[PDB]
């Protein structure tokens, strides 16, 4: 309350504001650093949020508005405002990184945070200094750290944009803010805002599929961003959204490039062509009224063809497409509401049908051709993710149980696996780590019984794939095989499509009573 009044005052002070501009910032930074000291020797992460909102964001916004005076050129404009920016930015960066260094200097976070985190932050190295994973204060410390990493990320993104001459950005231009954001996501994956800011980076490089995916992750994490759905909608649902208009331009560029079959083109088709398909289900009106509207069947056929023919070098993007799509079904429900009409039930059903069409295509043309592949985790990881999703939602389970194509596909896969009770393990796999706090799979992939992990040592490292007991790629593949056979058998137990275990063959066959 009284704290809120103080930061509003910082904002108003800076709005009124060569040298005295830096002076004002220094004074405000000095007070904030002092609040943070009093907080750390529940206020901490709140102090940092009010800092971003009332002090830093309004500054960065002004540089944006001004930069956009340049592009609509102003050479004398670019370097001049880039000069005053470089007077201010090191202070902003210091406010957040000081807090990190402060935090890591007082307390041991190894009970809550991966051990190599200090290393990654170039932070150098008592019994009571070790924070227990359940105290309120321990949570406040980690959240404070996450905020520092988050706002360093945003600041870095803003700088890169100003430091750029054109609105053309190569892939690795945002490498530095992406690293900070990656670390922020790692230590508290529940926070949607980290994914949101990552997606904003990808909008600059025009990786709109990566952007959509990050926007979906930001809307569906256990603590989602409020800007998650607005940005998703700006990209896929708003005829007048700047992101949407850009998407259409990208689809233009791809249209004229479809004849080329360089990997880079196959990859971009898989990143982009799923977008209009998802768009048309969630935002049907928007995707009936544009220049690409009559190309919807084309997008799907080419997407599916690229997946069948070109999955080997592009499997990582196919994996992303799967999660985006699963997430998009819940985007659909949040955006279009609880189904009520006969028509709204059928629209929702049509989307689910398309989703399972994608599943069976993945299973039939990709995973079935790669279930022995011990080198790439993605093949069997995709099967785990489908099953974990399906077991998480009654409506989805019922659709899946009654889907003949999907049940047939799982029978074929399960039978191949059988030809190769509940499994356990000592650490998280790649796909586990990626989907931590993802809502549609209920925040953790629950096909394994990770019950005992909590009683094991080095738990934070275990939950980011690091342990003394790391298995070979082969062993990890074997572990996925077991959990898939187990989940698939549980799923098939009550399927409604006539599939049953032939107890002589010990394989699944199709049956009927007559």
């Amino acid at each position: 309350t009284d704290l809120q009044e103080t930061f509003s005052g910082f904002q108003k002070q800076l709005q009124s504001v060569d040298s005295l501009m830096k002076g004002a910032i220094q004074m405000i930074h000095s007070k904030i650093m002092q609040m943070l000291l009093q907080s750390l020797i529940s206020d901490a992460h709140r102090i940092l949020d009010l800092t971003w909102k009332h002090v830093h964001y309004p500054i960065f916004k002004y540089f944006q508005n001004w930069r956009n005076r340049n592009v609509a050129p102003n050479y004398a404009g670019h370097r001049q405002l880039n000069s005053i920016l470089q007077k201010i930015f090191p202070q902003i960066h210091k406010l957040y990184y000081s807090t990190l260094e402060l935090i890591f200097a007082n307390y041991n976070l190894t009970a809550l945070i991966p051990s190599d985190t200090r290393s990654k932050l170039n932070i150098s190295t008592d019994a009571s200094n070790v924070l227990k994973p359940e105290d309120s204060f321990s949570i406040d410390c980690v959240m404070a750290s996450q905020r520092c990493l988050l706002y360093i990320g945003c600041s870095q993104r803003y700088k890169i944009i100003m430091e750029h001459l054109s609105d053309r950005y190569q892939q690795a231009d945002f490498q530095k803010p992406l690293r900070y954001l990656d670390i922020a996501s790692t230590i508290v994956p529940s926070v949607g805002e980290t994914f949101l800011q990552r997606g904003i980076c990808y909008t600059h490089t025009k990786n709109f599929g990566n952007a959509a995916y990050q926007f979906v992750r930001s809307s569906l994490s256990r603590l989602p961003s409020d800007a998650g759905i607005p940005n998703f909608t700006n990209l896929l649902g708003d005829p007048n959204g700047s992101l949407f208009k850009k998407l259409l331009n990208s689809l233009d560029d791809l249209k004229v490039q479809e004849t080329i079959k360089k990997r880079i083109i196959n990859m971009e088709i898989m990143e982009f062509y799923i977008l209009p398909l998802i768009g048309s289900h969630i935002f049907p009106q928007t995707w009936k009224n544009n220049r690409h509207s009559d190309r919807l069947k084309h997008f799907q056929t080419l997407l599916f063809d690229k997946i069948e023919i070109r999955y080997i070098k592009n499997i990582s993007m196919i994996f992303q497409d799967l999660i985006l799509l699963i997430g998009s079904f819940h985007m659909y429900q949040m955006i279009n509401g609880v189904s009520s009409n006969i028509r709204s039930i059928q629209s929702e059903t049509k989307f689910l049908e398309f989703i399972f069409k994608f599943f069976t295509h993945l299973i039939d043309k990709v995973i079935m051709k790669e279930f022995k592949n011990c080198e790439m985790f993605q093949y069997l990881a995709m099967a785990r993710i489908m099953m974990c999703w399906i077991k998480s939602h009654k409506n989805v389970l019922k659709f899946a149980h009654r889907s003949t194509s999907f049940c047939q596909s799982m029978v074929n896969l399960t039978n191949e696996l059988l030809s190769s009770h509940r499994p356990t393990r000592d650490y998280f796999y790649e796909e586990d780590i990626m989907l931590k706090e993802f809502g549609p799979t209920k925040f953790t992939l629950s096909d394994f019984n990770d019950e005992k992990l909590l009683s094991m040592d080095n738990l934070p490292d275990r939950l980011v794939g690091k342990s003394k007991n790391k298995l070979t790629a082969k062993e990890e593949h074997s572990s996925r095989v077991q959990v898939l056979v187990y989940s698939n058998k549980k799923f098939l137990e009550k399927n409604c499509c006539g599939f049953k275990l032939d107890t002589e063959k010990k394989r699944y066959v199709h049956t009927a009573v007559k």
Binding site: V142, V188, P189, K391, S392, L397, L463, K490, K494
Partner: peptide, 17 residues
């Protein structure tokens, strides 16, 4: 009431709950 950190501690294919 709500802990933002990842907690490993808390259906398996039954249509009936």
């Amino acid at each position: 009431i709500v802990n933002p950190l990842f907690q490993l501690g808390l259906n398996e294919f039954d249509s009936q709950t």
